[PDB]
Write a protein that binds this ligand. Structure first.
Ligand code: G8T
Ligand code: G8T
Ligand code: MG
Ligand code: MG
Ligand code: MG
Ligand code: MG
Ligand code: MG
Ligand code: MG
Lengths: 236, 5, 236, 5
């Protein structure tokens, strides 16, 4: 790996500099190098890892959707044949996206998840595993599409089971997991009713636990509760 | 699109 | 070159798709491949080339300024020593920026400028040459800094001489050249009075020529005139 | 920063 010669602390420092400069590809490469040092990640370092790759793949997904929309329009009735170029370029972006997802899933599998024993870290990584299988599912069309969808479901489900046993209902990692698993149900698994039920039940159970929280914890939890409410409003 | 974190 | 096997028309088509997807690195690579086919560029293709690289280097300059600011703060009195990391990462981004500028200047030199005979194309390319030497000048600190600055000046000056002889004072390429050369005077050459004089004289001479223009040409010209006025307001 | 095109 190109980052093998750099100190772990220097990679963490440069990941933070890249975030400040909005250089998320650099940020992800630095955090990939940090993970490959083999030590477990701190809470802050987990956020650096997730922020970097969320921004990288987020840009790829946005571009893929633009190109996929153009491609679908070119395949409509009455459209002039433009050649293979739109499909080729959509495929290029799709392949790069899949490469990033495979990279993240590889870091989780070798060996972040198996060494994560605390509920907070294990749920965080399993949520990430569900997320990046979900991104693969968004572009999947082949023989393994159902297996990709079930890999996302399985990761999300294990994270949910741990989070319900080991974390309070206002825990922001538990809330963000539920938010994303709900979106998985709605957009990937064609289960809008399960999506709505999960978002509402997550919101209500967090609402009843807010009284236990400090002002700062309250702000964290209510911010994600608002995202659950936003989705429920979009879906109902 | 719906919100995810 | 990685694009040598793709049709010129397909590269142009994919450059436009990349622009729609805001994938400017892809857009620049496609347009680099198109230029290296060896044929001259059309008016529209020149815009594809300039838009792609302007966005790529614009992002690098923004990141370089963030990192340079952090570096200067770390070198102030009372600042804690953080190690070489900030300088290293600023140097990394700086080196990538210089590589892009060298790439663009290489395309202009081999062989866009020497084949550009019409005033519109020749001024366009010479303005680009001034622009990318200006970007090199922004990060230059070594023995060749004055030579980089003079390379920018020389390119801008040849473009100005042609544009004053061969284009009307409302021509948008002539106006954009004057806008950027004025910024060169202000920010690079430490000549704010020349910057202000050029912007004002360019604005006034365009104003007096607007009566000759169609509605659509009027919109093009007045849009860039407003940018000249914006800079004059910033500088006075 | 000043405007350039
Ligand atoms: S780890 C990056 C910053 N954390 C936030 O994005 C967020 C919402 C979160 C929640 C679940 C998974 C990933 C990220 C968060 C976490 C903790 C406290 C507040 C917000
Ligand atoms: S070529 C990309 C689009 N052209 C505009 O950015 C702009 C302002 C221009 C002007 C000078 C150099 C480069 C770009 C322009 C050109 C022509 C008409 C209107 C605007
Ligand atoms: Mg070490
Ligand atoms: Mg594919
Ligand atoms: Mg249930
Ligand atoms: Mg051919
Ligand atoms: Mg240097
Ligand atoms: Mg003069």
């Amino acid at each position: 790996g190109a980052m093998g010669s750099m100190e772990r602390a220097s990679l963490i420092q440069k990941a933070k500099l890249a975030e400040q400069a909005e250089r998320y590809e650099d940020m992800a490469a630095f955090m990939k190098g940090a993970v490959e040092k083999g030590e477990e990640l701190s809470n802050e370092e987990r956020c650096l890892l997730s922020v970097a790759y969320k921004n990288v793949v987020g840009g790829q997904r946005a571009a893929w959707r633009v190109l996929s929309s153009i491609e679908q329009k070119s395949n409509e009735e009455g459209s002039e044949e433009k050649g293979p170029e739109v499909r080729e370029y959509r495929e290029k972006v799709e392949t790069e996206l899949q490469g990033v997802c495979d990279t993240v899933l590889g870091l989780l599998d070798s060996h972040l998840i198996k060494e994560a024993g605390d509920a907070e870290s294990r749920v965080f990584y399993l949520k990430m595993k569900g997320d990046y299988y979900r991104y693969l599912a968004e572009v999947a069309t082949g023989d393994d599409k159902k297996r990709i969808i079930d890999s996302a479901r399985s990761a999300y489900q294990e994270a949910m089971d741990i989070s319900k046993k080991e974390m309070p209902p206002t825990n922001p990692i538990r809330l963000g997991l539920a938010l994303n698993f709900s979106v998985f149900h709605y957009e990937i698994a064609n289960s809008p009713e399960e999506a709505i039920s999960l978002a509402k039940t997550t919101f209500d159970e967090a609402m009843a636990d807010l009284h236990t929280l400090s002002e700062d914890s309250y702000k964290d939890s209510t911010l994600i509760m608002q995202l659950l409410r936003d989705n429920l409003t979009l879906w109902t | 699109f719906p919100a995810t974190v």
